[PDB]
């Protein structure tokens, strides 16, 4: 009952953590796409 609600709140915190991890993974993919774009930029420049 009450322990179930507390575990639900803890699982909500863990789900926020997982959503943050997924958003960070997507952001990392975008950042490394930008890094590949930059690498191509100075590579074509070189």
């Amino acid at each position: 009952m009450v322990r179930f609600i507390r575990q639900e709140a803890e699982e909500k915190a863990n789900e926020i953590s997982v959503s943050a991890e997924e958003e960070f993974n997507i952001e990392k993919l975008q950042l490394v796409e930008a890094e590949k774009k930059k690498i191509r930029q100075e590579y074509e420049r070189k």
Binding site: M1, F4, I5, E8, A9
Partner: protein, 311 residues
């Protein structure tokens, strides 16, 4: 309509003695009660926030139910043709009202969110907000029809105070003097009969005045032209069309809105019963209660059966 008549029975202690007894072979059913209902569990167990929201919005749900009932009753009364709907004709949850309570198929993701009860409360509030638009539209249609119907065909039938151009005789004027010899050609009689005409001619204004309003009978007021009478008749036809629309097509729309409001009230009652069960039983969604409309002695029998779990 019908007020909320569902006893708040948790799953562990249902309406009858046994939890499964509520569905069939109930002690209430021994008194011929049609009480039979079920609830579709939510995807996840609702949090204490959902119970708090239900407790806070109980008054709001009561207000919404009152608004829905008043709007439906007024729509049925005013149009005078929307009352033809019945429990099966309303088709709450695609079933008659008795079967509507037993039908929990409306608790899917379609109207409710099907998410934890916290989102279910918001979905119910959104449904009530949408339902309020039905009452607003009904009020607007009623106002428009009442304006249209009273606008025309409310005058007289000719040769009277108003709309006397329809009974006009078409040197002469619309008088219809209801309870003359001169040089002017008074040897004439107008066809302004429903009233009567008098000997008059336009060559002498004195003769026309004497025959219309100088003494005795008074000249009745009329629409300026017979074309005004024809336009009044056309507007009367249009007003009859608008009133018939409001009383038949808008009445059917009002009956559909009443059925939708009954379905929404049933869903809100199911949500409230789920909240009450969560208060009186395990938090995860689980209900075994029943809903019906028995007599006062039937309510007493239900209370005797469910005294194990009483509020």
């Amino acid at each position: 309509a019908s007020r909320y008549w569902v006893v708040s029975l948790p799953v562990q202690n249902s309406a009858a003695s046994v939890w499964n007894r509520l569905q069939e072979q109930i002690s209430k059913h021994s008194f011929d009660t049609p009480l039979y209902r079920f609830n579709i569990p939510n995807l996840r167990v609702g949090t204490l926030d959902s119970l708090l929201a239900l407790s806070d919005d109980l008054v709001k749900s009561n207000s919404f139910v009152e608004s829905v009932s008043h709007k439906i009753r007024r729509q049925i009364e005013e149009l005078e043709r929307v009352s033809g709907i019945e429990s099966s004709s309303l088709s709450v949850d695609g079933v008659p009202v008795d079967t509507y309570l037993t039908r929990f198929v409306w608790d899917e993701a379609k109207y409710p969110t099907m998410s934890p009860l916290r989102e279910i409360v918001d979905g119910i509030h959104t449904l009530v907000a949408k339902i309020e638009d039905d009452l607003k539209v009904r009020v607007a249609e009623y106002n428009n029809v009442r304006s249209q119907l009273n606008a025309i065909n409310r005058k007289q039938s000719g040769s009277l105070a108003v709309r006397d151009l329809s009974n006009l005789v078409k040197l002469v004027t619309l008088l219809a003097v209801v309870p003359t010899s001169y040089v002017v050609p008074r040897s004439s009689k107008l066809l302004y009969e429903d009233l009567y005409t008098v000997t008059l001619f336009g060559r002498v204004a004195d003769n026309f005045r004497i025959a219309a309003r100088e003494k005795g009978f008074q000249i009745r007021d009329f629409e300026y032209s017979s074309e005004a009478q024809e336009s009044r008749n056309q507007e009367l036809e249009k007003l009859v069309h608008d009133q018939e629309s409001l009383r038949s097509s808008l009445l059917q729309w009002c009956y559909t809105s009443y059925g939708e409001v009954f379905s929404s009230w049933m869903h809100f009652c199911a949500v409230r019963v789920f909240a009450e069960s969560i208060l009186r039983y395990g938090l995860p969604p689980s209900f075994l209660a029943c809903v019906l409309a028995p007599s006062v002695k039937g309510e007493k029998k239900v209370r005797s059966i469910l005294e194990e779990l009483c509020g």
